Design an enzyme around this catalytic site. Sequence first.
Site, PDB file in Angstrom:
ATOM      1  N   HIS A 191       0.999  -1.408  -0.117  1.00  0.00           N
ATOM      2  CA  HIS A 191       0.157  -0.192   0.002  1.00  0.00           C
ATOM      3  C   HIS A 191       1.115   1.428  -0.099  1.00  0.00           C
ATOM      4  O   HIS A 191       0.095   2.339  -0.249  1.00  0.00           O
ATOM      5  CB  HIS A 191      -0.986   0.091   1.105  1.00  0.00           C
ATOM      6  CG  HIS A 191      -2.085  -0.970   1.087  1.00  0.00           C
ATOM      7  ND1 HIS A 191      -2.796  -0.943   0.231  1.00  0.00           N
ATOM      8  CD2 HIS A 191      -2.391  -1.824   2.158  1.00  0.00           C
ATOM      9  CE1 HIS A 191      -3.667  -2.058   0.447  1.00  0.00           C
ATOM     10  NE2 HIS A 191      -3.522  -2.667   1.683  1.00  0.00           N
ATOM     11  N   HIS A 211      -6.057  -7.037  -0.652  1.00  0.00           N
ATOM     12  CA  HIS A 211      -6.392  -5.547  -0.927  1.00  0.00           C
ATOM     13  C   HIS A 211      -5.637  -5.137  -2.016  1.00  0.00           C
ATOM     14  O   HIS A 211      -4.492  -5.779  -2.414  1.00  0.00           O
ATOM     15  CB  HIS A 211      -5.917  -4.691   0.424  1.00  0.00           C
ATOM     16  CG  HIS A 211      -6.505  -5.395   1.751  1.00  0.00           C
ATOM     17  ND1 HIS A 211      -5.906  -6.147   2.382  1.00  0.00           N
ATOM     18  CD2 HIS A 211      -7.904  -5.232   2.160  1.00  0.00           C
ATOM     19  CE1 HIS A 211      -6.773  -6.418   3.554  1.00  0.00           C
ATOM     20  NE2 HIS A 211      -8.126  -6.005   3.352  1.00  0.00           N
TER      21      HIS A 211
HETATM   22  K   LIG Z   1      -3.705  -7.707  -4.062  1.00  0.00           K
HETATM   23 ZN   LIG Z   2      -3.942  -6.954   2.694  1.00  0.00          ZN
END
Ligand SMILES: [K+]
Ligand SMILES: [Zn+2]
Length: 367
Positions: free
Chosen positions: A142, A181
């Site tokens: 991220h 994610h």
């Molecule tokens: K991913």
């Molecule tokens: Zn994750």
Amino acid sequence: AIGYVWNTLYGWVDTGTGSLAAANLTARMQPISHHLAHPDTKRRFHELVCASGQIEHLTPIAAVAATDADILRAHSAAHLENMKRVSNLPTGGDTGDGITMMGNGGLEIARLSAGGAVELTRRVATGELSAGYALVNPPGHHAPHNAAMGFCIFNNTSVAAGYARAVLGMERVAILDWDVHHGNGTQDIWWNDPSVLTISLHQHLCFPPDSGYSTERGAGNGHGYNINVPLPPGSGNAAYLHAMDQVVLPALRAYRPQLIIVGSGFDASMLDPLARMMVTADGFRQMARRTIDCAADICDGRIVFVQEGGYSPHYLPFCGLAVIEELTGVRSLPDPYHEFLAGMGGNTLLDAERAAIEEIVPLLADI
Ligand SMILES: [K+]
Ligand SMILES: [Zn+2]
Ligand SMILES: [K+]
């Protein structure tokens, strides 16, 4: 020869006293011993690698702290300086987004996390090892070029790819991210760059809430070299394997990377609190097997797994062990949850899952 990285300090990450954000008395968010991202989950995976005897079939590789130069291949100078600042605080602090705590001195651990990925990559690329698994913490995917985000301080897989590009002279690297994610940080870093193919499978709009659409394809020379595969909540083994066979493996074959780096999260697991997916240890096993066989076919087996997320201290160790067993080709243990979870489903491809994946197939033409 399969390399394996663990560093004691990966288990010392200080996630603070909140659940997700900090504890806050006016909000009546009671403090709690274990934040969702507490290091025990990943330590329990390491301990199972050892206790299962899998460690006997692995080559332990010591993490080496990532240098400023290493970090700067993926990140801005201001971001690095900001992490030095927070790390120097007496109790550390949040790094910007409200959910990413770094403890006092935590920059040391972030350096070792990114350096564990780099050191494994170096040894695989040199041919000293065939492949490996870097069980790092904190996670990376991220963190974009200029920020920490979503528990991630530095983008470990991008620091490794940057090293493979700039130091090792590789021309094409693929980063395949199956953390549940969206890998927005990785997407950001290589957005304009066709020399690193970035692929993310994820629950649609799970985290971040505003990215991961399949329309996000990169820009300029990089257009066509970012592929997102957002999937609906409730997707399990059948959906994930359909995505692997229909989109991921063809993308890698079309791209011809010299090295495949896997952002290996287990938060798509059936028992994870931070997503709604239904993958079991066998699903992860089959995903690993397919990806490893692809690497064997297209890039002389050069594949490096790097830990991303996963939040079940109960189940993540078995999901992780399954992947490592696929690397060594030596089986140590059954998944004791197999039957218990088998009855819950996820093993049938649903029409909405099929439709989501089939949306992505046309993008393969541009690789
Ligand atoms: K991913
Ligand atoms: Zn994750
Ligand atoms: K890219």
